[PDB]
Amino acid sequence: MKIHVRDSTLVRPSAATPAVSLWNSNVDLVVPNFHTPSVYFYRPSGADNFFDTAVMKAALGRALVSFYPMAGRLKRDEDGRVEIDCNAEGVLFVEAESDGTVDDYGDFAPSLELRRLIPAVDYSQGISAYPLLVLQVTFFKCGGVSLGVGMQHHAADGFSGLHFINTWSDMARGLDITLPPFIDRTLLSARDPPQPQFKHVEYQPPPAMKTYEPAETVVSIFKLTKDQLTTLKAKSKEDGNTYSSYEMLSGHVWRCTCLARGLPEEQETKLYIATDGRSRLQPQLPPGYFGNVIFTATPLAVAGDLGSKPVWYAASKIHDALARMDNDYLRSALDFLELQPDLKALVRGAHTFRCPNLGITSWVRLPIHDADFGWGRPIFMGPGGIAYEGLSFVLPSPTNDGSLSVAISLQAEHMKLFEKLLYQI
Ligand SMILES: CC(=O)c1cccc(O)c1
């Protein structure tokens, strides 16, 4: 498939916005340096103006008025701390055409082929050289359209990013803003002086694999029916042992991964779980809080135990890790991060999620399919390509059947067994 760009432009806020330097909290600093990829897919609705770029950009400019930090640029203060220069330079909007079809992506497994649907960024010209948000509307050879999104997570996390996209689509349909964004990250300032309370196991080195081959990593996606999810939930009754569907599913995935990887009985495994601090921070963050509030629960386990014990054993560990992440624990994290000499060094990479470990996040809660720009909701949305092994995304169904999908990156030889184990319910 070849893709070629008809036009690219910088879309600025439709009206005047504050000219300020937006301070970043420690959560807003422990982020990747690249743009986080995500992709929306749409089927033709039969409309003559399907995804009219003028309509899209008009609404984009209107949304960037309240979401003005999105149209800003990265800068560093006198101490070298990354902050957001809200200068309204604008976000990048790319219109592109494809000689292929939406069907070419099949089940929309998040392979690196999705990256082509998202504008590339030159990271060699300073952190101030590129927009915080890059957008690509691609028209396929079937009438279908993809919306590719690259968002610098110095701006905000995926939760606020989703808040922006849905607001954009709302305005594209003529709607006014439902939830106005709150823009002040000083609410997540560390205490003075910083008083950490736990050692924070989340930032400790993960279990290793004695060795380490090269690894041919593949990406797949598997649908689980509502009945399959219901059957998995009542497995909490096993061995005379209630955990939620999410806790049980994440435990199920964690367990299946260990068995698929053929982990030794004694091998330790560490699970990384993205959790939203918005729910537990005190006092409650204002609705529409614009920034990063995503933390990580990291339960430890023995591969032999996960396999020989019921799923609720895995779920219990997951539940315990999440339960101890109250306000005090998160407040301690801000203080612990504050004392760290290098925050970027704490950002997790391929090494973190290599065998025997795993990272998981669940997007079912998000209104990820509420991005209706006037021509219908997305037929799919997911991460814009997964680069390395050991990442899993739990995606809800676009339909109302209550099914979900587990997208995941594993070694090629491990992926085949994982599919078998995932459906052993
Ligand atoms: C994005 C994602 O899937 C993930 C999973 C675990 C940890 C983490 O920081 C991120």
Q: How far is the CA of 367 from the centre of ligand 1 (A)?
A: 19
Do 186 and 235 reside in the same domain of the chain?
Answer: no
Phi first, then psi, for residue 172 (nearest 5°) are -65, -25
Q: How many CB atoms lie within 10 A of CB 236?
A: 19
Would you state the structure tokens that stand for residue 72, as one six-digit string?
């800003």
Do 118 and 255 reside in the same domain of the chain?
Answer: no
Method of determination used here: X-ray
**Which residue has a Cα nearest atom 1 of ligand 1?**
361
Residue 414 near residue 142, CB atoms below 8 Å: no
Residue 149 near residue 37, CB atoms below 8 Å: yes
Do 316 and 362 reside in the same domain of the chain?
Answer: yes
Do 217 and 153 reside in the same domain of the chain?
Answer: no
Domain end among 151, 186, 205: 205
Q: How far is the CA of 423 from the centre of ligand 1 (A)?
A: 23
Q: How far is the CA of 87 from the centre of ligand 1 (A)?
A: 31
What CATH number is attached to the domain comprising 168?
Answer: 3.30.559.10
C-alpha 10/C-alpha 368 separation (Å) is: 25
Identify the CA nearest to 111 among candidates 393, 425, 422. Answer: 393
Do 351 and 230 reside in the same domain of the chain?
Answer: yes
Q: How far is the CA of 398 from the centre of ligand 1 (A)?
A: 22
Return the best residue to mutate from 348, 362, 406, 408 for the ligand 1 pocket (most ligand atoms within 8 A of CB): 348
- Asked about 372 being catalytic, the answer comes back as yes
Identify the CA nearest to 315 among candidates 301, 326, 329. Answer: 301
Q: How many CB atoms lie within 10 A of CB 107?
A: 11
Residue 50 near residue 386, CB atoms below 8 Å: no
Containing structural domain, residue 76? 1-205
User: SS3 sequence, the chain?
Assistant: CCEEEEEEEEECCCCCCCCCEECCCHHHCCCCCCEEEEEEEECCCCCCCCCCHHHHHHHHHHHHHHCHHHHCEEEECCCCCEEEECCCCCEEEEEEEECCCHHHHCCCCCCHHHHHHCCCCCCCCCCCCCCCEEEEEEECCCCCEEEEEEEECCCCCHHHHHHHHHHHHHHHCCCCCCCCCECCHHHHCCCCCCCCCCCCHHHCCCCCCCCCCCCCEEEEEEEECHHHHHHHHHHHHHHHCCCCHHHHHHHHHHHHHHHHCCCCCCCEEEEEEEEEHHHCCCCCCCCCECCCCEEEECCEEEHHHHHHCCHHHHHHHHHHHHHCCCHHHHHHHHHHHHHCCCCHHHCCCHHHHCCCCEEEEECCCCCCCCCCCCCCCCCEEEECCCCCCCEEEEEECCCCCCCEEEEEEEEHHHHHHHHHHHCCC
Do 254 and 386 reside in the same domain of the chain?
Answer: yes
Residue 195 near residue 271, CB atoms below 8 Å: no
Do 331 and 348 reside in the same domain of the chain?
Answer: yes
Q: To what resolution in angstroms was this structure determined?
A: 1.9
Pocket, ligand 1, Cβ cutoff 6 A: 272, 274, 296, 348, 359-361, 391
Do 223 and 123 reside in the same domain of the chain?
Answer: no
Domain end among 156, 183, 205: 205
- Asked about 52 being catalytic, the answer comes back as no
Longest dimension (CA), the chain: 63
Nearest atom in ligand 1 to the alpha carbon of residue 272 is 6
Would you state the structure tokens that stand for residue 165, as one six-digit string?
């996209």
Tell me which of 35, 153, 319, 369 is the catalytic residue: 153
**Which residues, in sequence order, are bridge partners of residue 41?**
146, 380
Residue 70 near residue 131, CB atoms below 8 Å: no
Do 196 and 239 reside in the same domain of the chain?
Answer: no
Do 58 and 189 reside in the same domain of the chain?
Answer: yes
**Which residue has a Cα nearest atom 9 of ligand 1?**
274
